[PDB]
Amino acid sequence: GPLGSMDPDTFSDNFNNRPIASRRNTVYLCYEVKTKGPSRDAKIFRGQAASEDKYHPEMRFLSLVSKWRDQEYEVTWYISWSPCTKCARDMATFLQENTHVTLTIFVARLYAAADPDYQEALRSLAQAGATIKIMNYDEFQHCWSKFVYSQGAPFQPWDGLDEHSQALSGRLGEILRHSMDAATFTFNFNNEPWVRGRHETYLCYEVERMHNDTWVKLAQRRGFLANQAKHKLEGRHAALCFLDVIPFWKLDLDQDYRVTCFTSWSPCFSCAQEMAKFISKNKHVSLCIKTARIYDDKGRAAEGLRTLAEAGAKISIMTYSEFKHCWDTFVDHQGAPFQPWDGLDEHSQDLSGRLRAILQNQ
Ligand SMILES: [Zn+2]
């Protein structure tokens, strides 16, 4: 194992998009610096380093891209975990201040845990002039063949490489676009009460401040999220993941707000109790939960919705207006209008009647 390299046991430990997470918060970055120009035979300078905080040898390339005569640089990152909340912002600053440097980042695992500032930092880094993509078979093979000391051993992938590297691609697309996919929305937000294959739960949310005598939308605070799930790397539900993102808003305690939650699946009993116990401790928030389908939760969901509404939560079923409003704001439509599926108003009124029955104690 030559110094400055990673033996195969270190590669197949950091660059592995399988569910397993990072209890040991370690990241490993491989960098390729090239002189921008016409040369297809340009000498690419490769290096690699893992996060070592004290001295930071992973940033030993920032001196390799100093402005030197009329030379531009192309940098290619093969980073293990997604960049940090502060590292991404600092790299955006550096890309803004150093115009002669272009950067292309390849991510193996995205930071599953989120924070509005983290998404903001990734989007600002993308705006700065960087290109972020998820590693697939080509990138994993190209990294194994130039940053791993393999004594002849060829690259052997895992079972679900593309199956995970495409889910992470969709996650990154949702993160960078600030809008989810149109097919994803037309799939998850369905109106029929009994469906199949809707394992994940998507949740959009809007905030409105009470100014003058009017709810004014805090348009800089709207956003969506999805559940985590999976195993072998557990995860919370979408409602609980929304109850975690609220403290990062720095809400004013003297004024009142209205928070609207557009949910694909209605909250279960655990999430309903957690939401009730949250809004009971934050009386400066009026929660209105507009849902698409009514999640039965094996029976214990009607009582959960009843308990949630007894604290002061406006539970309701999405109609055509709410579906179209969710289309024009949270999905990547690119100008296309909302074309609703057949039966929208029918299942809408049916689920409204069933919710009214549930709420009239039934
Ligand atoms: Zn739940």
For residue 292, the SS3 value is: strand
The rounded distance, in Å, linking the Cα atoms of 317 and 355 is 8
Structural method: X-ray
- Count of beta carbons in the 10 Å neighbourhood of residue 119: 19
CA of residue 274 to ligand 1 center, whole Å: 9
CA of residue 192 to ligand 1 center, whole Å: 19
Quote the tokens at residue 17.
């998009």
Query: Residue written as tokens 């100014």?
Result: 211
Same domain, 161 and 209: no
> What DSSP state is assigned to residue 214?
E
The rounded distance, in Å, linking the Cα atoms of 320 and 314 is 18
Q: Do 309 and 287 touch, CB atoms closer than 8 A?
A: no
Q: Is 143 exposed, middle or buried (0-12, 13-18, 19+ CB in 10 A)?
A: buried
CA of residue 198 to ligand 1 center, whole Å: 14
Query: Residue written as tokens 């940090």?
Result: 84
- Count of beta carbons in the 10 Å neighbourhood of residue 281: 8
* Resolution, Å (one decimal): 3.5
The rounded distance, in Å, linking the Cα atoms of 239 and 226 is 9
CA of residue 11 to ligand 1 center, whole Å: 36
> What DSSP state is assigned to residue 246?
S
Same domain, 161 and 188: no
The rounded distance, in Å, linking the Cα atoms of 325 and 335 is 14
The rounded distance, in Å, linking the Cα atoms of 235 and 240 is 10
Phi, psi of 341 (to 5 degrees): -70, 160
Same domain, 199 and 239: yes
Q: What is the CATH number of the domain that holds 304?
A: 3.40.140.10
Q: Do 287 and 313 touch, CB atoms closer than 8 A?
A: yes
The rounded distance, in Å, linking the Cα atoms of 162 and 160 is 6
The rounded distance, in Å, linking the Cα atoms of 163 and 17 is 10
Quote the tokens at residue 7.
């033996």
Distances (CA, A) of 81 to 176, 236, 312, 328: 17, 21, 41, 33
CA of residue 144 to ligand 1 center, whole Å: 40
Q: Specify whether the backbone of 236 is left (phi greater than 0), alpha (psi in -120 to 50) or beta.
A: beta
Instruction: Work out the angle at residue 337's Cα, subtended by the Cα atoms of residues 334 and 340, and round it to the nearest 5 degrees.
Output: 130
CA of residue 201 to ligand 1 center, whole Å: 9
End residue of a domain, out of 161, 177, 193 = 177
The rounded distance, in Å, linking the Cα atoms of 252 and 233 is 35
What is the identity of the amino acid at 117? D
Phi, psi of 63 (to 5 degrees): -80, -20
Quote the tokens at residue 102.
């272009």
How long is the chain?
362
Domain range for 154: 8-177
Quote the tokens at residue 16.
């592995």
The rounded distance, in Å, linking the Cα atoms of 189 and 264 is 5
3 domain residue, yes or no: no
Phi, psi of 105 (to 5 degrees): -100, 140
Give the sign of the dihedral formed by CA 43, CA 44, CA 49, CA 54: positive
Same domain, 249 and 173: no
Same domain, 129 and 115: yes
The beta strands (E) that lie in the chain are given as 28-35, 45-50, 73-81, 101-109, 130-134, 202-211, 214-217, 223-226, 257-265, 285-293, 313-317
DSSP string for 108-145 = EE--SS--HHHHHHHHHHHHHTEEEEE--HHHHHHHHH
End residue of a domain, out of 177, 206, 229 = 177
The rounded distance, in Å, linking the Cα atoms of 102 and 36 is 9
Quote the tokens at residue 14.
């950091």
Please tell me the chain's helix, strand, coil percentages from 3-state DSSP, rounded to the nearest 5: 35, 25, 40
> Among 52, 61, 5, which Cα is nearest to 26's?
52
The span from the first CA to the last CA of the chain, in angstroms, equals: 68
By the CB criterion, residues less than 5 angstroms from ion ligand 1 are 237, 268, 271
DSSP string for 52-88 = -TTS-GGGTTTTTTS--SS--EEEEEEEEEPP-HHHH
Same domain, 148 and 201: no
